Design a protein around this ligand. Structure first.
Ligand SMILES: CCCCCCCCCCCCCCCCCC(=O)OC[C@H](COP(=O)([O-])OCC(O)COP(=O)([O-])OC[C@@H](COC(=O)CCCCCCCCCCCCCCCCC)OC(=O)CCCCCCCCCCCCCCCCC)OC(=O)CCCCCCCCCCCCCCCCC
Ligand SMILES: CCCCCCCCCCCCCCCCCC(=O)O[C@@H](COC(=O)CCCCCCCCCCCCCCC)COP(=O)(O)OCCN
Ligand SMILES: CCCCCCCCCCCCCCCCCC(=O)O[C@@H](COC(=O)CCCCCCCCCCCCCCC)COP(=O)(O)OCCN
Ligand SMILES: CCCCCCCCCCCCCCCCCC(=O)O[C@@H](COC(=O)CCCCCCCCCCCCCCC)COP(=O)(O)OCCN
Ligand SMILES: CC(C)(COP(=O)(O)O)[C@H](O)C(=O)NCCC(=O)NCCS
Lengths: 245, 304, 83, 33, 34
């Protein structure tokens, strides 16, 4: 019925790059300013395509990442607070989780983008933070539950015993899963290799640096302030040396 | 006829491809079926053909890593049965709830649920067996060691699994269907993995432990090495924290250079048919001719 | 403060047992950690940490290097307790 | 008696638990694609 | 009373955290599309 006209637009470089997606708003603005002051002013301007789809997906991706992150970090804080009746341990663990996530993704960005030249797919970040949060919860909770049940004999001896007991198990589990995930590097699909090796390098870094040195050393610096609302002793009342045998 | 992302779209792409390659062109002419709908078809059809090689390589790696952790074939076998039974129960339960239209599935929620189920199952099995063997190496008999394992790790497994379930159910509140469809199947998968890990795990440990020396520890000097690491941590915590934070800074300083990409034909083999159609078109027009925009201006009066 | 040498050795042998595994019948005042008991420099730090936690005996890091034999540790703890 | 109820029941009823999980997996994987 | 709100400080902290998180989430759910 002649009420709508359509134009078919082609891009120069890659439509689905960061620039081909920033061009969508510019196309809409150009078409809107073209009918300004003409009898067609006020017409509805619809822009469909495939770079428009990815503009909208890229916009929604940020907010969905934020929703998932807020939700997961609050759940993690809540379980670390319920288990260890302490706000400082929960906050320290949430902070080390955020720091280890950042460092993991930065390491994978380095390896993939700056060294191998291949940029990271846009879903790698999401699928990586999902799994990495999921397993960091496991390992941090197992470590700090043991720490809490053993600091009865002194915070330092409690940390020594908790390491010797649960740090080995945490690293075994972490390394098994990390090397399972780094076997995706054999896929022809580069997105599978990217997500697999991102999860794998993240877990390697976590279990070998963060959860193995940065979390218990923070528990050792903050001696009794690691359990703050609970009043714990740095070490028990000194015992007298035992009688022989 | 489909809708990009669904299965009717792939039906349509293969139908069109059938129609097109059904008849022969003149000599010299070659026809293709390109576009972000045939590319998605070839992508989703090569995803499974790579996934079935991954399902073998990851298990071939899991087995050798279990042999390296537990220097024993019987223990690796037992704990692998734990993991495999958990994964089977999870896949079965979610395929059941999706088959009877009780919950909403996806061909992406499944590929993530299998990964997460394997992660959780191996973690919980290693936790349980590690605590049992640690209590066993301190001199406790099989009964006391079983009870120490439970009293130490059951609440941890329960809490951590229930938070994974809650966190992955909180995905249901996102907007993209990619993430939004991960909510209920992943939460249900985690609940099933946790129920399995807490009932079937300890059951297998309590049955197999009463025979010979099945689950008895072998490598306990690892506990000594980790006690020495803990001693170094409690004696000099400041320096070690500084070192760990310095290492984490290397990764944290690369993040403000992160650029992403939405071209799926960069992360796919160039051997796919749709990508070779893309190449044939790029030989002649340009890279962006097969991905056109459409702008419509709808006015209220006849514009002819 | 008059813990006899046998009491101090009885307390040290429990920590050495837990840290390493050497039987308390093997911890005698004339054996040196480095060769006879084979206790490296980093298990001595753990023994010192656990001794400080249990019996309040603080052995600083620089003195821990010069305590070669079990007799050295017992004498250090006695000289510290006679304060 | 002095053993908690949950692990004690899991230990006493261990083999019916394993058999039940096996039956569940069988049903769930044979009745459904 | 302060004596009784410090036996129930964990559920209160959980409520305030869940409330702030839920409000932020229902606020961010509106940005897309709009
Ligand atoms: C697709 C193809 C497939 C590919 C994938 C598939 C491949 C399949 C095969 C996979 C092969 C890998 C196998 C993995 C190991 C499996 C073994 C296992 O599961 O556990 C058993 C294993 C025990 O083995 P064991 O022989 O039976 O133990 C008996 C000992 O002999 C008896 O004790 P000892 O007398 O010999 O020594 C005492 C003690 C040691 O005691 C000590 O003295 C240590 C304390 C010293 C004082 C403290 C100083 C610490 C300073 C802190 C500074 C900041 C932190 C930096 C830490 C680094 C320096 C330590 O040793 C220990 O046993 C405990 C070790 C604990 C410390 C180790 C912590 C790791 C440090 C971090 C290194 C890596 C950096 C991570 C970065 C990665 C991120 C990219 O458990 C461990 O020890 C875990 C640590 C070793 C494994 C992790 C090391 C790396 C593994 C791969 C990581 C790759 C990194 C690459 C980075 C390259 C640069 C970019
Ligand atoms: C979609 C659902 C998810 C929504 C919910 C989101 C938030 C989930 C939060 C879940 C919190 C669960 C709390 C469990 C951890 C409790 C932490 C704690 O306080 O530990 C105490 C644990 O106290 C207990 O005794 C609790 C024992 C719990 C036993 C675990 C139950 C096993 C049930 C087996 C079947 C599981 C079926 C589950 C099906 C999903 C410490 O006691 P203890 O030091 O003396 O050591 C324990 C020795 N017995
Ligand atoms: C921005 C990047 C920053 C990286 C920071 C990494 C820091 C990690 C620290 C790694 C510590 C490695 C284990 C340390 C064990 C300590 C054992 C010890 O103290 O004694 C030995 C110390 O031996 C060591 O292993 C020293 C540690 C060497 C590793 C130091 C490298 C890590 C720091 C990297 C600096 C940043 C690099 C620049 C960016 C690439 C004996 O030494 P010696 O007296 O016999 O040697 C005398 C011979 N002339
Ligand atoms: C990702 C989400 C993060 C959001 C949350 C961030 C952290 C918020 C921290 C807010 C702290 C509020 C908790 C206050 C704890 C009060 C402790 C208490 O009331 O009882 C203790 C009393 O000990 C005291 O004397 C504490 C008195 C000081 C309370 C003053 C509140 C300080 C607020 C700190 C501000 C930090 C806020 C940071 C916000 C970003 C001991 O009681 P209990 O042992 O019987 O309970 C244990 C068994 N369930
Ligand atoms: C602990 C010992 C005594 C270990 O020596 P043994 O292996 O002969 C070490 O030399 C020492 O004094 N200071 C090192 C401090 C340290 O380890 N800091 C953490 C590293 S950043």
């Amino acid at each position: 019925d002649g009420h709508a006209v359509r134009f078919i637009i082609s891009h120069e470089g890659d439509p689905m790059s960061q620039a081909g997606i920033a061009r969508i708003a510019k196309i809409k603005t150009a078409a809107k300013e073209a009918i300004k002051g003409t009898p067609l002013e006020g017409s509805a301007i619809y822009l469909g395509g495939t770079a428009a789809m990815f503009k909208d997906l890229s916009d929604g991706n940020t907010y969905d990442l934020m929703i998932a992150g807020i939700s997961a970090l609050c759940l993690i804080f809540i379980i670390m607070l319920i288990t260890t009746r302490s706000v400082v341990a929960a906050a320290v663990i949430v902070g080390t989780v955020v720091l280890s996530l950042g460092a993991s993704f930065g390491l994978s960005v380095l390896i993939w983008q700056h060294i191998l030249g291949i940029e990271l797919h846009w879903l790698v970040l999401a699928m990586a933070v999902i799994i990495l949060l999921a397993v960091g919860a496991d390992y941090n909770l197992l470590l700090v539950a043991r720490l809490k049940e053993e600091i009865h004999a002194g915070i330092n001896t409690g940390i020594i015993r908790a390491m010797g007991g649960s740090g080995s198990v945490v690293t075994a589990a972490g390394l098994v899963f990390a090397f399972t995930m780094m076997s995706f590097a054999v896929s022809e699909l580069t997105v599978m290799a990217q997500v697999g090796t991102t999860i794998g390098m993240g877990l390697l870094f976590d279990t070998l640096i963060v959860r193995s040195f940065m979390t218990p050393s923070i528990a050792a610096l903050l001696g009794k302030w690691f359990w703050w609302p609970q009043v714990v002793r740095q070490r028990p009342i000194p015992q007298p040396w035992p009688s022989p045998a | 006829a489909g809708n990009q992302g669904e299965s009717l779209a792939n039906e349509s792409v293969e139908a069109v491809k059938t129609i097109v390659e059904r008849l022969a062109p003149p000599p010299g002419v070659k026809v293709y079926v390109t576009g972000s709908a045939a590319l998605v078809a070839d992508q989703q059809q090569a995803g499974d053909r790579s996934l079935q090689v991954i399902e073998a390589v990851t298990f071939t790696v899991i087995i050798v890593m279990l042999l390296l952790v537990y220097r024993s074939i019987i223990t690796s076998a037992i704990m692998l049965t734990m993991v495999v039974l958990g994964l089977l129960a999870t896949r079965g339960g979610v395929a059941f709830l999706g088959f009877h239209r009780i919950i909403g599935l996806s061909t992406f929620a499944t590929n993530l649920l299998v990964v997460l189920a394997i992660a959780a199952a191996t973690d919980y099995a290693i936790f349980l067996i590690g605590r049992y063997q640690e209590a066993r190496g301190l001199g406790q008999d099989r009964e006391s060691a079983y009870y120490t394992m439970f009293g130490g790790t059951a609440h941890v497994v329960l809490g951590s699994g229930l938070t994974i379930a809650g966190a992955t159910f909180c995905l249901s509140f996102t907007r993209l269907p990619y993430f939004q469809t991960l909510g209920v199947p992943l939460a249900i998968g985690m609940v099933i993995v946790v129920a399995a890990a807490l009932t079937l795990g300890p059951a297998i440990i309590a049955v197999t432990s009463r025979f010979g020396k099945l689950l008895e520890p072998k490598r306990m000097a690892r506990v000594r090495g980790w006690r020495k690491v803990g001693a170094a941590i409690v004696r000099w915590p400041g320096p070690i924290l500084v070192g760990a934070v310095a290492l984490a800074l290397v990764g944290l300083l690369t993040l403000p250079g992160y650029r992403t990409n939405y071209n799926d034909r960069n992360y796919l083999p160039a051997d796919l048919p749709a990508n070779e159609g893309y190449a044939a078109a790029e030989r002649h027009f340009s890279q962006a001719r097969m991905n056109p925009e459409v702008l419509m201006v709808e006015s209220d009066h006849d514009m002819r | 403060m008059a813990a006899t040498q046998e009491e101090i050795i009885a307390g040290l042998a429990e920590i050495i047992e837990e840290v390493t595994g050497i039987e308390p019948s093997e911890v005698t005042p004339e054996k040196s950690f480095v060769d006879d008991l084979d206790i490296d420099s980093l298990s001595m730090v753990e023994i010192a940490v656990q001794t400080e936690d249990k019996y309040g005996v603080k052995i600083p890091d620089e003195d821990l290097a010069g305590l070669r034999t079990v007799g050295d540790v017992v004498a250090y703890i006695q000289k510290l307790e006679e304060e | 008696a002095a053993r908690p109820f949950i692990p004690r029941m899991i230990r006493t009823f261990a083999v019916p638990i394993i058999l039940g999980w096996l039956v569940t997996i069988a049903v769930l994987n044979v009745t459904v694609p | 009373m302060i004596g009784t709100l410090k036996r129930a400080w964990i559920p209160l902290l959980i409520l305030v955290v869940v409330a702030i998180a839920g409000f932020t989430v229902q606020r961010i759910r509106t940005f897309f599309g709009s």
